Amino acid sequence: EQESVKEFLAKAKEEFLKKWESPSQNTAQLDHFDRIKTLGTGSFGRVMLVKHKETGNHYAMKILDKQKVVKLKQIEHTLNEKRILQAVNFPFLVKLEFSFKDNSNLYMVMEYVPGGEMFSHLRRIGRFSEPHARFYAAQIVLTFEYLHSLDLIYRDLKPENLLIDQQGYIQVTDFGFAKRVKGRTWTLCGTPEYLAPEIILSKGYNKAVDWWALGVLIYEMAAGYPPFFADQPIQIYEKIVSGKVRFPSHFSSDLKDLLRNLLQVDLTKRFGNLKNGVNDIKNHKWFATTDWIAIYQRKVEAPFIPKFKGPGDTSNFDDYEEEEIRVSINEKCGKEFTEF
């Protein structure tokens, strides 16, 4: 690549490694914040809109219950998530502002992105046009170029994890499965529709799984549904490993060609994992109209700007039962989470 890209990535890695080696810890506490509204909820945590009581700034606070993290075998994953997030810096990654823990929970306080998840917008519109999908895809390509150069695999690409910001650009969130990996890794994780064949088949896999997932995402953005759908995961997995994909007739020939090379079941032949690396993707005809530098610099006008009233507006997120943030009087799982 141009020396300009090499030097950019060398500096990116220098800065990442310094923070990776000496992570920040314990940079706020719960009673610095007011709770506003639950924005999302899962099996071991939830994300809440909060407001800092002294500055008035809004943030999204991810709260993980230490005991449930342990029960669901997510200890290392949660430690990965925080250690990576506090060390990365890129225009399309949600910024971690504070982290801390208490007797019961782990907390990651992030910039609040009021536009909501791409998932909502995609389902509301139906599908994105190719230019619209391409604008988002280009951001993911650059983000993966960045992450992979740091030896990071993301492992959870899907529309729910892509927030739309006030300029209409992507912020990737949820580093719960992200990991620093030189070579291969083995954990079964991800969402079924987005899993590469080599994950399903229990292989030692690498960053090529992220490029497969990009193929799934581009297909889903442009079609409105993912390429390997079914009612049971096992039936999804059979389709994924089959080597067959059908494309809507409205897809351009260039889109189909790119997707055949991303959704390549032989990981040794998959775009993003060949000798030319990311440049096989960036130079593909489907991306011929993309000005990569202008995307990075946020100079391209976005396909749309989410509608929201201000930094406290939660309209683009949905409604969940509001549950307590209870902190035990006794420390739980202290040893397991020492480094957090």
Ligand SMILES: NC(=O)c1ccc(O)cc1
């Ligand atoms: N950073 C955010 O605004 C955010 C919002 C909802 C989530 O589920 C995760 C993150």
